[PDB]
Ligand binder design. Structure first.
Ligand SMILES: Nc1ncnc2c1ncn2[C@@H]1O[C@H](COP(=O)(O)OP(=O)(O)OP(=O)(O)O)[C@@H](O)[C@H]1O
Ligand SMILES: Nc1ncnc2c1ncn2[C@@H]1O[C@H](COP(=O)(O)OP(=O)(O)OP(=O)(O)O)[C@@H](O)[C@H]1O
Ligand SMILES: [Mg+2]
Ligand SMILES: [Mg+2]
Lengths: 235, 235
């Protein structure tokens, strides 16, 4: 129901890239995290997901501090994650890519894994790429496959690190509906992207980060005229 | 059990890189596939595992033709695979890398996954790297982690594609001992590597391929005396 990060801090050498960052995502809502290149968004995703150790802070699900849980146990509790950088298996076919994911699924039979594979391919308009290898896909084809992989894991909370990069405008609409639809079924989404228009359109609320600190919080319409935010991020 | 490949063939352009290759491994044996760079060893491995389509040939386990099964279904039937190129997750720690694989394990409870993790890390002498990230490891540390990952999947048959590249001589001896131990437990092994002396030492018999044809077979002593093998491979 509730995923909360409190007082996250991270430094490299001594560059404070995240300091005292707190945020919350509830199931059945889409929440943004936006900000300048290097502001510390991917780093906060790392700390929530469990891939770098934090300098300070706590990760909580439903009044349960899971800060000491390793990555795999946090994923078992429902945290999913789409990396920013490419993560498709380059030698595997699209279908193989999604099946490697659906292997983890103790809630689906062999037949239901099959159908879920086809279903995702049809939803993302990639069924014609079924037997294409990862390495032979175009930039947007590859990204949409990676989004489908991350969804195929059926998380409770999904952190999407720049899902729209390389993605055409029509697929960006299509993906927004896939995500809206899963939100309706209780999926919590934390999303970052620099396609600000399309991202804010689907967000119920959003956080703004800049040089490692939160500098704003609220609706799309609100964020779009916070004076600090126009100066440091929007133009 | 018995894993057989029969009459495998594969061509790219007007270059047939594998032609009429047949191989077999039984549980409880270690078998080599050796031969010049480009001879078609990795290509054969891809056809057995299921990542490249075959031009001709059949894959059989015991009395079952599994040629039509996809990669995930062949792995469920007990085919395992260590890729030649790097496959570690670069942003995960050694421990996370191991746990991500031990997630697929229906036969181990959460406590038993973690004992298997520590057990693997101590057998490969990598426990001091437990929380080091994939990308910051040396070449042989990275390779040893990749072998542990492939064995963590508990296959019935494992195809090891150049496991000793980058690995120091002491760890080579250690790895030979770890796989001889799993051989004694019923694991079948198909191994290819250019450390000829060390690889033939643990093989009971081997095949020599050159330009995609089998040109020799037999014990290590037989392989090493064959004049065809000296000329095209040993030099
Ligand atoms: N291992 C590292 N060592 C030193 N500095 C690092 C390391 N990793 C990241 N940084 C720095 O920390 C800052 C923030 O990294 P981060 O990836 O969190 O940015 P981001 O908010 O995701 O931005 P973008 O919008 O460009 O993706 C960057 O300026 C980056 O160069
Ligand atoms: N996609 C491709 N297109 C064209 N040629 C290819 C392709 N993939 C592999 N080859 C060629 O197939 C031949 C066999 O490759 P393979 O990877 O099977 O060799 P190997 O026996 O594994 O050699 P090494 O001992 O260097 O790993 C090579 O000469 C390679 O150049
Ligand atoms: Mg980033
Ligand atoms: Mg090879």
């Amino acid at each position: 129901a509730t995923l909360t990060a409190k007082n996250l801090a991270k430094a490299y050498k001594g560059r404070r890239v995240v300091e005292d960052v707190s945020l919350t995502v509830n199931s059945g809502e889409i929440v943004g995290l936006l900000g300048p290149n290097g502001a510390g968004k991917t780093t906060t995703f790392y700390m929530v997901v469990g891939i770098v150790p934090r300098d300070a802070g706590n990760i909580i699900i439903d009044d349960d501090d899971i800060s000491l849980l390793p990555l795999h146990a946090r994923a078992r509790r429902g945290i999913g994650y789409l990396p920013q950088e490419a993560s498709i298996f380059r030698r595997l076919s699209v279908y193989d890519n999604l099946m490697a994911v659906l292997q983890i699924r103790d809630d689906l039979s062999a037949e239901q894994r099959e159908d879920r594979a086809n279903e995702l391919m049809e939803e993302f308009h990639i069924e014609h790429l079924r037997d294409s290898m990862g390495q032979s896909l175009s930039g947007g084809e590859r990204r949409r496959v990676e989004i489908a992989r991350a969804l195929a894991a059926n998380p409770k909370f999904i952190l999407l690190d720049e899902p729209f990069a390389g993605v055409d405008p029509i697929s960006v609409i299509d993906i927004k509906r896939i995500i809206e639809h899963l939100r309706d079924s209780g999926l919590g989404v934390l999303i970052t992207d620099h396609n600000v228009r399309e991202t804010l359109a689907v967000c119920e609320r959003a956080y703004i980060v800049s040089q490692g600190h939160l500098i704003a919080h609220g609706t799309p319409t609100e964020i779009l005229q916070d004076e600090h935010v126009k100066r440091v991020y929007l133009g």
